[PDB]
Design a protein around this ligand. Sequence first.
Ligand SMILES: Cc1cc2c3c(c1C)C(C)(C)CC=[N+]3c1c([nH]c(=O)[nH]c1=O)N2C[C@H](O)[C@H](O)[C@H](O)COP(=O)(O)O
Ligand SMILES: Cc1cc2c3c(c1C)C(C)(C)CC=[N+]3c1c([nH]c(=O)[nH]c1=O)N2C[C@H](O)[C@H](O)[C@H](O)COP(=O)(O)O
Ligand SMILES: C/C(=C\c1ccccc1)C(=O)O
Ligand SMILES: C/C(=C\c1ccccc1)C(=O)O
Ligand SMILES: [K+]
Ligand SMILES: [K+]
Ligand SMILES: [K+]
Ligand SMILES: [K+]
Ligand SMILES: [Mn+2]
Ligand SMILES: [Mn+2]
Lengths: 500, 500
Amino acid sequence: QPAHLCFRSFVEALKVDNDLVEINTPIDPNLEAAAITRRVCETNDKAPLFNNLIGMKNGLFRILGAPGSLRKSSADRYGRLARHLALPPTASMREILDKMLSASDMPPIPPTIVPTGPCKENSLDDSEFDLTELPVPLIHKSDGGKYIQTYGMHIVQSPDGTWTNWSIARAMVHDKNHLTGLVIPPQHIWQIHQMWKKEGRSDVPWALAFGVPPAAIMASSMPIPDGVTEAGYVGAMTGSSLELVKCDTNDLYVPATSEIVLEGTLSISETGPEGPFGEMHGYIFPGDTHLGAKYKVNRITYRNNAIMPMSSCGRLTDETHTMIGSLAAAEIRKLCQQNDLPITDAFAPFESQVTWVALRVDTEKLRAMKTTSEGFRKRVGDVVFNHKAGYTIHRLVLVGDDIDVYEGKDVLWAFSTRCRPGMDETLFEDVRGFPLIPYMGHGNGPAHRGGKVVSDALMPTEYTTGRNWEAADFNQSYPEDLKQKVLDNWTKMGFSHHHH
Amino acid sequence: QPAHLCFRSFVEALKVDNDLVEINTPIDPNLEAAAITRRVCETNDKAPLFNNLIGMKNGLFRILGAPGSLRKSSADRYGRLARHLALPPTASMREILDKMLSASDMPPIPPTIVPTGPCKENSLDDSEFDLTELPVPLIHKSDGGKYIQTYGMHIVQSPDGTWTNWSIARAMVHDKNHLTGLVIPPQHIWQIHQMWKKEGRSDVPWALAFGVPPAAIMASSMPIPDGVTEAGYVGAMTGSSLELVKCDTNDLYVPATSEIVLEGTLSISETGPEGPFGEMHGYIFPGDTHLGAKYKVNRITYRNNAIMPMSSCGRLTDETHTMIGSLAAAEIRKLCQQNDLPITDAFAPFESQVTWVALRVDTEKLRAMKTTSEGFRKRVGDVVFNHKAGYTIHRLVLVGDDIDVYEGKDVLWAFSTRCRPGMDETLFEDVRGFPLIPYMGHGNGPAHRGGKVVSDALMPTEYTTGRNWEAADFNQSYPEDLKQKVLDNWTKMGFSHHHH
Ligand SMILES: Cc1cc2c3c(c1C)C(C)(C)CC=[N+]3c1c([nH]c(=O)[nH]c1=O)N2C[C@H](O)[C@H](O)[C@H](O)COP(=O)(O)O
Ligand SMILES: Cc1cc2c3c(c1C)C(C)(C)CC=[N+]3c1c([nH]c(=O)[nH]c1=O)N2C[C@H](O)[C@H](O)[C@H](O)COP(=O)(O)O
Ligand SMILES: C/C(=C\c1ccccc1)C(=O)O
Ligand SMILES: C/C(=C\c1ccccc1)C(=O)O
Ligand SMILES: [K+]
Ligand SMILES: [K+]
Ligand SMILES: [K+]
Ligand SMILES: [K+]
Ligand SMILES: [Mn+2]
Ligand SMILES: [Mn+2]
């Protein structure tokens, strides 16, 4: 199976890429696995594969950390993400995001049902497992539970059967047969849960699949539209129908090569303590436990020598930055274009802790609109901040065509030099806010409302006659022939490789 | 003479440091010298010494580029600045700024007059020089003149004799015997010029000394208080009285080892075209010429084999960032402390294009104040933005004790995650603005007023009971013994030097 279609092949691909460290000596899931992974993520090192986890029994489980994190070299910086998608390891972020958007104007390719797969190699009924006895990691020292679920895909379906959603949402072990987790608006798992709650008749049939096809976990992390079944989107993106097998205890379908599958129900009535957790913005608030959604696990199925992927999330750079931020940015780019806004590119700068998105404007198109900053900012902010794709983003930075939004240094330069504080900004207090940002949920104002801004880093003539400056940099301040002479004589004179 | 007291020795020091490239083949002052220097600055390479400048005659002049720019390695990143001050090349920014502040609670050490020095080795009267015939550089292709003055010190004295100011302000060649330059409020050259204009009797006696003692050019770049003679401040800082020689045509005194000295007058009546110039924020606006101050040159004196220092300023990183920003930050730190504000550290992040200053708060002291964000931000902003030391700075970011303000990644993290847009900010529209920032002078609002903000990145409990989080990072999320184990086993397991 190809790497983008099968997690076990993905792990092989990482090895072949010299992008994997296999650790075959005993490693403690209580903090040690996650500490090693955290250090990987902070240093852009090779992904760790923990083959000898303390408390592993009867094949459950090994751990792969840092599945979607960054590589050290510039040339293949996003190579791990490229390996989720069948792209060359040198693929640019623009190419990755374009691949993730590609299915948005294609017919879905629905999944294909097959009778069995590797995920059925082993099973444990409700008399044979205990979640508290598995080597579930403690990821951060102050976490309020052992977070089994940091890189699996929740599967829930609308009551009418017409929408099956795949998404990542965190979850931790509650007891031998239950998890607690975040199920919050406006997320699709929450939207579907609300449909079942209004019906009021049963708990939500649910499955959680770990080590799914990489292309599927990327879609699971992206805010594709309401009502769109991720499996068909992933089929269109990859050009192939995904192979799924029915759960044993319910009628949901899981990827045939899933490493580990939990089957059960998401309660429409019960809650339990959840959190705190060391989160994407870089913080944990010890002791902040709150009631979360409660999942009952009825069955576990798993591959021989099952591997559990894990995100040791926090400060830069991990899957919560590379995937949450970038994929939200991609969806925002498309949303803007569909609303006739002249946006060419979008990215969530890592320097912003993926709380900003920089929007590159086609300023020729802008000029033809014959508008102003005040009007344009309001239009952009209304479109984005009133939509689910904008949920996680609190600052939009508008930049002109000279700025590469995928380069945080350039975004910061434009923001700092082209956007006059106050005057060139519009605040949005009557929009949904993202409570997980510390200044929201632990801040001075309402956790769930407001705190958003559009910052216009377009210069005045960009709306009228065109750019009226040149950068005071080597590229723009010197003629072509001079530049080339300097470069050609550089090492000759005495001054100081792409791949590396 | 020591390196910090003599520019010629400073150049030797750079050579000895392996921090100098001598270019002995012909180099064009029309763009080529500055292009090479620009590339140095963008790459943190060795400083260029142009010993064979096209149009050099009778000893005027060689050029040293990038005198105050950054080195590549982390360990000696600020080494060139350290060499201005007799500090070890590994000195931290905190140590550099502390050295620059040290004289603020010392008695001045006034200068010593000596009968001659190297600066008198050669002279040219007003029948023997023509400024248009010297190898003055064109620094950026769109500049409105040849900017002779990018790293010399203007010397002007109050009419009553009691204050002699040394400062850097740009100037370009107007004609054979005149310069034009920026003389703008609230700068001390402007304040003194206004005193002479009100007196109305004569033009201002003036000298411009290039290649001055390095410790003097650092003070020239710092907003030490009104009425304080820089020479005595530099004497106290260095522990030695500076040796000065009288000008030939007026009664001002210049450093004895100055490389090149221009003597003449700054007009109280005349102006001429000045600019545009590629400036510290990274831009040039071609064609934006405006009337500037006009200087008449009556005499040139210079060392044998004189060297002119040059700043090829623009995008990161050069003297306008390392010196303007950092030295302003230093003065702001002191100003805050003198106003009983609990600020421990200040720095202008390079990522902000030195338009922000991050202020580290002693939060124990803050807690004892029993205040709020709104009140505290207003107090801080009133103190700083109403003072000349705050002139160039448009955003203040307040951060707690966990943040190293000298590390831009950490400042950006705190700003993005702890300061709620709008609610946690106070805008200042009735303060002096810095027109050189593009969003000011080329923006949507008044060039000279407003556009400033205090952004509070202190979390709520920092004002009350204390920090209530831990970072989700390797350092804070894992116990000491674990961390050390991971580090000790790092290379053993398969994962990847201070000086580099
Ligand atoms: C990549 C990724 C995405 C997480 C995520 C993590 C990762 C690694 C964690 C597990 C390490 C930490 C928490 N995360 C949550 C999360 N969304 C959410 O609602 N709750 C979460 O707990 N997301 C974001 C969520 O996957 C995206 O917002 C999707 O758009 C949700 O899919 P949907 O659009 O179908 O609702
Ligand atoms: C380091 C440095 C400082 C420049 C400077 C440059 C450099 C290299 C240039 C030459 C490359 C470009 C322009 N600069 C000007 C400038 N201040 C000013 O009023 N006009 C200027 O043209 N400054 C800042 C000025 O030196 C500081 O604000 C001082 O505090 C002024 O001294 P004062 O406090 O005694 O007025
Ligand atoms: C960041 C996070 C949850 C989240 C992320 C994006 C959207 C919604 C919730 C968490 O579980 O720590
Ligand atoms: C930046 C700049 C002038 C300046 C700098 C700091 C304070 C005042 C003016 C210039 O000459 O380009
Ligand atoms: K999804
Ligand atoms: K703007
Ligand atoms: K000064
Ligand atoms: K705050
Ligand atoms: Mn969905
Ligand atoms: Mn002064």
